[PDB]
Design an enzyme around this catalytic site. Structure first.
Site, PDB file in Angstrom:
ATOM      1  N   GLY A  35      -6.195   1.550  -1.546  1.00  0.00           N
ATOM      2  CA  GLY A  35      -5.695   2.839  -1.984  1.00  0.00           C
ATOM      3  C   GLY A  35      -4.849   2.676  -3.229  1.00  0.00           C
ATOM      4  CG  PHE A  37      -1.302   3.086  -0.565  1.00  0.00           C
ATOM      5  CD1 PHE A  37      -1.527   1.903   0.123  1.00  0.00           C
ATOM      6  CD2 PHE A  37      -2.156   4.153  -0.346  1.00  0.00           C
ATOM      7  CE1 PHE A  37      -2.579   1.788   1.010  1.00  0.00           C
ATOM      8  CE2 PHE A  37      -3.211   4.045   0.542  1.00  0.00           C
ATOM      9  CZ  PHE A  37      -3.421   2.862   1.222  1.00  0.00           C
ATOM     10  N   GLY A  38      -1.722   0.622  -2.625  1.00  0.00           N
ATOM     11  CA  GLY A  38      -1.895  -0.797  -2.393  1.00  0.00           C
ATOM     12  C   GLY A  38      -2.994  -1.048  -1.379  1.00  0.00           C
ATOM     13  CD  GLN A  39      -4.869  -5.456  -1.261  1.00  0.00           C
ATOM     14  OE1 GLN A  39      -5.953  -6.040  -1.233  1.00  0.00           O
ATOM     15  NE2 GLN A  39      -3.730  -6.076  -1.555  1.00  0.00           N
ATOM     16  CG  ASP A 154      -4.305  13.859   0.980  1.00  0.00           C
ATOM     17  OD1 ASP A 154      -5.239  14.631   0.677  1.00  0.00           O
ATOM     18  OD2 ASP A 154      -4.353  12.627   0.781  1.00  0.00           O
TER      19      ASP A 154
HETATM   20  O1  LIG Z   1      -9.405   4.224   6.659  1.00  0.00           O
HETATM   21  C1  LIG Z   1      -8.776   3.692   7.574  1.00  0.00           C
HETATM   22  C2  LIG Z   1      -9.477   3.099   8.608  1.00  0.00           C
HETATM   23  C3  LIG Z   1      -8.762   2.504   9.625  1.00  0.00           C
HETATM   24  C4  LIG Z   1      -7.377   2.516   9.578  1.00  0.00           C
HETATM   25  C5  LIG Z   1      -6.720   1.899  10.630  1.00  0.00           C
HETATM   26  N1  LIG Z   1      -5.336   1.868  10.663  1.00  0.00           N
HETATM   27  C6  LIG Z   1      -4.632   2.428   9.678  1.00  0.00           C
HETATM   28  C7  LIG Z   1      -3.245   2.356   9.781  1.00  0.00           C
HETATM   29  C8  LIG Z   1      -2.421   2.908   8.814  1.00  0.00           C
HETATM   30  C9  LIG Z   1      -3.006   3.538   7.729  1.00  0.00           C
HETATM   31  C10 LIG Z   1      -2.236   4.079   6.787  1.00  0.00           C
HETATM   32  C11 LIG Z   1      -0.928   4.261   6.881  1.00  0.00           C
HETATM   33  N2  LIG Z   1      -0.557   4.833   5.734  1.00  0.00           N
HETATM   34  N3  LIG Z   1      -1.553   4.991   4.999  1.00  0.00           N
HETATM   35  C12 LIG Z   1      -2.646   4.536   5.615  1.00  0.00           C
HETATM   36  C13 LIG Z   1      -4.391   3.605   7.635  1.00  0.00           C
HETATM   37  C14 LIG Z   1      -5.254   3.062   8.593  1.00  0.00           C
HETATM   38  C15 LIG Z   1      -6.677   3.119   8.523  1.00  0.00           C
HETATM   39  N4  LIG Z   1      -7.429   3.701   7.528  1.00  0.00           N
HETATM   40  C16 LIG Z   1      -6.946   4.322   6.436  1.00  0.00           C
HETATM   41  C17 LIG Z   1      -6.650   5.682   6.491  1.00  0.00           C
HETATM   42  C18 LIG Z   1      -6.148   6.338   5.373  1.00  0.00           C
HETATM   43  C19 LIG Z   1      -5.947   5.637   4.190  1.00  0.00           C
HETATM   44  F1  LIG Z   1      -5.460   6.271   3.094  1.00  0.00           F
HETATM   45  C20 LIG Z   1      -6.248   4.283   4.127  1.00  0.00           C
HETATM   46  C21 LIG Z   1      -6.748   3.619   5.242  1.00  0.00           C
HETATM   47  C22 LIG Z   1      -7.034   2.253   5.126  1.00  0.00           C
HETATM   48  F2  LIG Z   1      -8.343   2.051   5.231  1.00  0.00           F
HETATM   49  F3  LIG Z   1      -6.401   1.565   6.066  1.00  0.00           F
HETATM   50  F4  LIG Z   1      -6.640   1.830   3.939  1.00  0.00           F
END
Ligand SMILES: O=c1ccc2cnc3ccc(-c4cn[nH]c4)cc3c2n1-c1ccc(F)cc1C(F)(F)F
Length: 345
Positions: A35, A37-39, A154
């Site tokens: 993203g 933001f980072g990873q 969002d």
């Molecule tokens: O697409 C997924 C698929 C699985 C998954 C599993 N755990 C997650 C835990 C935290 C987050 C998250 C917290 N803040 N932003 C993302 C995201 C999680 C998550 N995400 C996710 C969801 C929204 C997002 F912007 C990014 C992710 C990411 F895939 F993990 F990067």
């Protein structure tokens, strides 16, 4: 030549390595996603003895500051000890690691967009949709708590995760784009497909914009396709108008960006502007009744004969959606009453 003593790339991201062990505690497994933001990385917390998801923020001040806002809101939500709290993803803790802010969340399976793709974008049942809808409304009710007053800002399939691969629970993620209720500061907000009319019109907004997003999302859940898939804001509004018709005059008269989409006629009435490419049905002639297939066996007729998918069931679903897709953010249905709708009995 090197960034952050060789730990980072040229995009201020921490170079994630499988097998690496952070702070004698977290065993890094694999990258979950990326993203701005980072990873986000999948790791094993050897202390709590459980899988966790670690959000590794980029090593740069701009993203660090934005992440601290998220930490503030998430911690703020944690202090409120209700059972509605459990439809928000739990921020377990946070720490600094090699100049990266790291947020430790609970580990969840996959996002709601992944579920759609698994259906080959044909959608899930009205029954599964009802379960998701009730939890989201409850989640929105929690954010409406006066001390919180948090706008997610969002809501979309990508930001809704499944709690367990064999259970029907969901949770909302990514409060990085989020802020609490207040004076208007930002105007280009929400993902386009789920962007409320008040945002598109450049008007003041509140927590109701999340309810709008929810309405869009729920339809997409049962059909498998976005309700309003605009290629731009003008296309987005015209797709919205196709379904719901021209917005009320009392709204458009007070809308700063009204004339980006509409035309005020000499009689004081508003019509659509003639654009360009593309072609739209007359205002309000793309009925949600027909999109959902209320009387024709559901979306694509793939629910014909299936239990929990009668005309009566679909009418309850349609009614709740239309209340969520109210042009007027002040009369748009609120979480407390959405949960009291006949669709959830
Ligand atoms: O697409 C997924 C698929 C699985 C998954 C599993 N755990 C997650 C835990 C935290 C987050 C998250 C917290 N803040 N932003 C993302 C995201 C999680 C998550 N995400 C996710 C969801 C929204 C997002 F912007 C990014 C992710 C990411 F895939 F993990 F990067």
């Amino acid at each position: 030549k090197v960034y952050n003593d060789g730990y980072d790339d040229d995009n201020y991201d921490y170079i994630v390595k499988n097998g690496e062990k952070w702070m004698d505690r977290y065993e890094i497994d694999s990258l979950i996603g990326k993203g701005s933001f980072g990873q986000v990385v999948k790791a094993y917390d050897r202390v709590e003895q459980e899988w966790v998801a670690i959000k590794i923020i980029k090593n740069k001040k701009a993203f660090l500051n934005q992440a601290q806002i998220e930490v503030r809101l998430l911690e703020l939500m944690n202090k409120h000890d209700t059972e509605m709290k459990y439809y928000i993803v739990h921020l377990k803790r946070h720490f600094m690691f090699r100049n990266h802010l790291c947020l430790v969340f609970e580990m969840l399976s996959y996002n709601l967009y992944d579920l759609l793709r698994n259906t080959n974008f044909r959608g899930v049942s009205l029954n599964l949709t009802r379960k998701f809808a009730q939890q989201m409304c409850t989640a929105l009710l929690f954010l409406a708590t006066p001390e919180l007053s948090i706008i997610h800002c969002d809501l979309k399939p990508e930001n809704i995760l499944l709690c367990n691969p064999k259970r029907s629970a969901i949770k909302i993620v990514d409060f990085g784009s989020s802020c609490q209720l207040g004076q208007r500061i930002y105007q280009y907000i929400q993902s386009r497909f789920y962007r409320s009319p008040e945002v598109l019109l450049g008007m003041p907004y509140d927590l109701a914009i999340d309810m709008w997003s929810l309405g869009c999302i729920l339809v997409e859940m049962h059909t498998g396709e976005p309700l309003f898939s605009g290629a731009n804001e003008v296309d987005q509004m015209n797709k919205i108008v196709e379904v719901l018709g021209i917005p009320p005059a009392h709204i458009l008269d007070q809308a700063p960006k009204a004339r980006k989409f509409f035309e005020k006629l000499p009689d004081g009435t508003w019509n659509l502007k003639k654009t360009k490419k593309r072609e739209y049905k007359p205002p309000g002639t793309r009925k949600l009744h027909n999109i959902l297939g209320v009387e024709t066996g559901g979306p694509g007729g793939r629910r014909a004969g299936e239990s929990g998918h009668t005309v009566a069931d679909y009418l309850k679903f349609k009614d709740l959606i239309l209340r969520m897709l109210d042009y007027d953010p002040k009369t748009r249905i609120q979480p407390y009453y959405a949960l009291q709708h006949s669709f959830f009995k």
